Amino acid sequence: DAWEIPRESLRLEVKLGQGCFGEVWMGTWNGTTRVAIKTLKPGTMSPEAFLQEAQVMKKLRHEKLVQLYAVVSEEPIYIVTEYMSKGSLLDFLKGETGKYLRLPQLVDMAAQIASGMAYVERMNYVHRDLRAANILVGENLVCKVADFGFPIKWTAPEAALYGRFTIKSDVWSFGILLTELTTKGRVPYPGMVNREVLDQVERGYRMPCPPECPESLHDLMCQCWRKEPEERPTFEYLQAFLEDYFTSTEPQYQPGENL
Template sequence: MSEKKNWVTRWDEVPQREEVKLDDKPWFHGKIAREEAERLLEPWRTGTFLVRESTHYVGDYTLCVCIDSRVEHYRVILDHRKLTIDEEEYFTSLPELVSHYSEDADGLVSRLITPVVSQKRDGGYSSQFEKAGWSIERNQITAGRVIGRGNFGEVRKGSYQGQDVAIKVMKDDKLQSQSFLAEASIMTQLRHPNLVQLIGVSSGASLWILLEFMSKGNLLDYLRSRGRSVVRKIDQIKFSINIASGMMYLEEKKFVHRDLAARNILVSDEDIAKVSDFGLAQHDRDLVEKSKIPVKWTAPEAVRNKHYSTKSDVWSYGILLWELYSFGRVPYPRVPADNVIVFVEDGSRMQPPDDCPDSIFDVMLKCWELNPTKRPTFSSIQRRLEDLKRQLLTDTKKMETDF
């Protein structure tokens, strides 16, 4: 009896469809009253927000932000074609202002986390996926067993058109679904053999997001369950190159992952490593609000100042390499998470894993430069690893010949 094949046996077999680019101001509700804004923001979860036209100051706006069980209303002043809340930071547009306060509260009661989408602008987010060819009817999908869980809901193995897929089943939560659809729109714009592929979205009682099914699970579990008896040095460097290639593509697209770690790398049936959660995980931002930043994987400037960039992803990649060559050990094994940033800022670094080649540890150390500008690009990392792979293959062939 033949087994089902994965939806994507080759990443480029996925039909090319249009990119979904959602409205850049879905949170703008126009001229609504204060009371209407507060009604729309119920149940007042911290970080939920919208923007409306000011009812008292013509030409200005009001940013409405939830904190605990109340709503704060901030006047956004239009001053010489620039927008400001505190007359210290100025922005050229509302999306720029929202983007800034999404990264850092910077004086607000909360960082902006979840937008309340205007129904006038929404037109149904899901309808935009349908127009672009990404919408899938629910009756075409068979959902199977649960294979993972997260704050967003659960992940199930399923099938679509006779192929295995992974299904992210979102909680029945309109605000969160809107946020995830916004992130899924990013995935429609990304296409690379070392990124997990979006297959489509399905709307119903809950939102389903279909992804390429990776039969061997995440890299962390893969390493821990197989160990040195199965995972060879050539496998380690191939995985390293796979991940660097996917990240190089994201670097070129100016997309920041924010949570690069072995747990977010998936392994295909063909032993190809692919970066996952590059769209859907990073806006599960309750983790950040609850100070659960994965400190041991995160660059110091991102922990201290929430300054995420491709260079902070490079730092995380160095940690991921350490995980890969230690066969899934937790980084900084003798350093408490609360002390990690002081540890690295003082100039200390982890020791190389057992049997880790010096050349690979050198790549890790370059990724862990305290000054982000001194860290390598993913492009240069990938080239260096390709060189090391060729050298390893040459050395292996020579040993076999000598033997």
């Protein structure tokens, strides 16, 4: 058991999520420390399929990966975790302060995610659904990699077509996630339906450079979007590249209207 707790500890205060097969609540733990809860909506998935997520989350422990705190085996099940106060990043980028973000805050932000995924990469694990809807945000623009568990527009074409879901198909996704950041949360492949994406991309189409995104950064995304998984960069290299960007790659970056 080890991470099992009682319902006596917890209190589910305001419903923040409304998942495929569950819900998500702000709360309080042992009446003191403020946490988040995944509640299985009963019948649907059962304590087998749902509770392999707590297995996986037990082994990972990293400063950019949402931290498991506790579990509740006896039904209804509450999977418990730290609370990211600004929520999902897609929400944050679309919300109040999205308009004030410039490219040093987005690229800093990006480097934290790459950090988390490098740790994921080190453990020989695949995420499978890397994107702005699976990144939570707390104060001071701290981002962490989360999971809320199909998206053609984020999934690599070798994983979408043939199921080769490797670390390097998360590398692909990271490049797309980068375009979300640089457009402020806009959906990939504007106007193009799932079917058009595959076909065009399959035939070499990549997203053009976002307006006011320098070309150096657009060369990074295309690096993630190479046709051969093994020629994609790595999260470590991407981490460093993003960390060093304004000294080593854009020292004449000058902020403008949007970025």
